[PDB]
Design a protein around this ligand. Structure first.
Ligand SMILES: [Zn+2]
Ligand SMILES: [Zn+2]
Ligand SMILES: [Zn+2]
Length: 178
């Protein structure tokens, strides 16, 4: 197994996947690494199994159809994994914890949002459809773009949004377009 956490790339107290060589800190894995279960399979393995059981799940989909899906167990897992993929980028640190807004010439957003809040919301089963999760994720970056205006710091929002969107299209097998 790897000797660093797959998500944050640090060593420490790691839990090892029994079906691939990845390792995780307890609260870096999403959901948090389970108390027992021997063997244990990580989220990357669980996602791979879904695809393998239903190869046609990788045929292309319309975003509008994906968003309206109810958050049954497999859609819940896919959103957990998509959230994890954003945390895997080190630039996610800027969007992880609750922000605050005091900048000359800007007003804070009406509805602040951050990754840890989405993480809690998923854990507490607060989203009933995929749309709920995706709207909150996109809101994180949209709030950032609006607040930071012409500062070059706006680019961090663009960059982390691109990681989100690429992973969304991959995980949910969105039909490729130009
Ligand atoms: Zn970690
Ligand atoms: Zn694994
Ligand atoms: Zn099938």
């Amino acid at each position: 197994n790897s000797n660093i956490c797959e998500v944050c790339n640090k060593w420490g107290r790691l839990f090892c996947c029994d079906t691939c060589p990845r390792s995780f800190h307890e609260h870096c894995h999403i959901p948090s690494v389970e108390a027992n279960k021997n063997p244990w399979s990580c989220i990357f393995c669980r996602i791979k199994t879904i695809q393998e059981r239903c190869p046609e799940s990788q045929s292309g989909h319309q975003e509008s159809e994906v968003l309206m899906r109810q958050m049954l167990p497999e859609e819940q897992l896919k959103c957990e994994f998509l959230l994890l993929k954003v945390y895997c980028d080190s630039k996610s640190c800027f969007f992880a914890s609750e922000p605050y807004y005091n900048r000359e010439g800007s007003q804070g957003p009406q509805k602040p949002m951050w990754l840890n809040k989405v993480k809690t919301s998923l854990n507490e089963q607060m989203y009933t459809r995929v749309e709920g999760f995706v709207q909150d994720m996109r809101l994180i970056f949209h709030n950032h773009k609006e607040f930071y205006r012409e500062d070059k710091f706006t680019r961090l929002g663009i960059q982390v949004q691109d990681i989100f969107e690429k992973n969304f299209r991959n995980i949910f097998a969105i039909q490729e377009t130009s």
